[PDB]
Each structure stands twice: as structure tokens, then as C-alpha cells.
Amino acid sequence: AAAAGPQVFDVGPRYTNLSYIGEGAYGMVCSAYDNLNKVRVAIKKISPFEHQTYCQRTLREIKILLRFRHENIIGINDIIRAPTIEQMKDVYIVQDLMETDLYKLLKTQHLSNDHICYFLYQILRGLKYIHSANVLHRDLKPSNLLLNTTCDLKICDFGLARVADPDHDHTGFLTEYVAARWYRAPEIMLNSKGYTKSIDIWSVGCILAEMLSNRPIFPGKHYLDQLNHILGILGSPSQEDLNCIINLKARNYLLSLPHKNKVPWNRLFPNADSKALDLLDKMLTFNPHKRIEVEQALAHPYLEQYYDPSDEPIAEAPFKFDMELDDLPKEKLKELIFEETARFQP
């Protein structure tokens, strides 16, 4: 069994010349030579079968990634697992080798306006497909956007993705939530379970702002300090936007806050393309119902060098019902993963 930072990384003979490229909360990621396609590739060792939570996110991500075929969404090339449920402890996901991600890029590289444009175009082109599948990503952030040496951008990490369910979105004030704090839409803290498409556009808008300045625009240290950062810049919600918040705890919190005027994007980003700041504004709308949708973003003048709706495909087979996973035992979930991975077995 090949070892890597000697654990087991048993991608047997087909995949060789392993090297560490990070880890996580499910397993470890490696580069590796594919002795069949003569090309380096990424491999994610996932060991989730101990905890029902890990099995859900793994089942979720594999189902979605197998259903999705799109240039700007990471593909699965292969899955390595034991031929039997009893022998299967780990699963290995084989994926196109991507040389970096937007997080790693933003810490060290200044982006030209052409790069920011093209990156944002590819993010929304990928998100248009995702949203057309009635899926919500719900964890869009720079580390979840992978790049190769020719700046092709692929969206990954569908662990927290749900089927859109806007009828059942409403919830109380300060409702708990799992996805990256800095990219969380204001309604998440206020009255939203994160079950409508507009939560992804908010995250994309945060990513645009980050690409313009190499800093996260809303670096809140905790849950309510996230809301303080957003209104620190958008200013106080209008009566109209408050009118939409019917839940009295959320409403009275927002009423309790001192008046703050809108801080206009040009003073935050004086070097930015004005068309970029215009699109940023529509993406970072306090009111989810007023927030630009993915197809309108793609049609924005900022993206006109790329905009081609004939070349921005939608999904053939959208998810038409929620994935009823929430309290299935981690034993049924291993079975479902076994079954979802069968097509890659010889």
C-alpha cells in the first residue's frame, strides 16, 4: 500500500508519484501520475463512514458531481473503492489536477482587470448551470474556486449544497448555519435558512469585492459581527427592505442600530472598472428579492466581452426533489455511496 506523509493512500498501481497538496476534515488530497492517461491528477482520500454528517456531505457531493457536466465545475474522472461494502473504509475521488485556487492566488497575486472579468465570467457561467439544476452551492468562497496555469476556473466543494426550496426558506433570528461566515448573505443572520438562489449571488459579490482589493470585504469575527460589517458598508436598510422582514426579533435588532449612510463602492475601490462596481452593487443588495440573478449578472456590461447565452449551458436533468438524507443511518449512507460509486468498478 503506497503511503503519503506515512497514512495509507492506496490508489494502487494506476496512480503513482504521490505528493501532499493539503488535507481537511474528511481526508487528505494528493497530486499523482495517472499511468493510463499520462497526466498528473488530484486525488481526495475521503474517510467519512464513522460519522453520519461526513457520509451525508460525501453522498451529496458525489451525486451532484456525477450529474453535472460543465467546463467551470470540477468533474470526477474516477473513484477508487473496495469492491465490497465490508472492505470499503476509504473512497478516493480522481479529479483534473488544478495548479491553485482563488484563495492561494489572492494572498500573493495582484489580478489585472482582464483576469477579474474572466474569473467572474467563469464563476457565473458555472453558477448559471448549478442554479439551472435547481441546486444551491451555499459555500462559494475563493478556496472553492480552482484554477489551472491557463486561468480555467472550476467550482468545487458541493458538500453543503441543497435543492432550492424557497417556499421553506423562512426561519427565526440568529438561526445556526455551517457555511463560510465572510460570504454569508445578511438574510442568513436575519430570517433565511439559505434555501433560495440569491444566497449564492451574495457570495459571488463578496468574491468580486475580494478580487478587486485582495482582502475579504466583510471580515466578521463572529455571527452578529458579520451583519455589522455588511451594514457598515451598505448603510442602514431602507423602510422598504425592513418591510420585507416580518420576524420581529430580526426587525427590532435592525431598528436598534445607529443610522449609517451607504458607503459608495468607488471610495472602497478607486482603481476598479466602474462597470465592475455597478455589478458589485447589484450582487451585494441587502434585499434578496432585489438582488441580481445569475443570468442578469452574465448580461451586465462588465462581462460583455464574454457574454454568450448560447455558450452558457443549463443542466439537462435538474434535481426536482430534496435529497432525503437528514436522518438516514451512516450504514444506509455507506450503502448509498457504495451504489453511487459502482460505475467506476471494472
Ligand SMILES: Nc1ncnc2c1ncn2[C@@H]1O[C@H](COP(=O)(O)OP(=O)(O)NP(=O)(O)O)[C@@H](O)[C@H]1O
Ligand atoms: N482538483 C484539485 N486539483 C488540485 N488541488 C486540489 C484539487 N481539489 C482540492 N485541491 C487542494 O487540496 C487541498 C485540500 O483542500 P480541499 O480538498 O479543496 O478542501 P477540503 O477541506 O479537503 N474539502 P473540499 O472543499 O470539499 O474540497 C487544498 O489546498 C486544495 O486547493
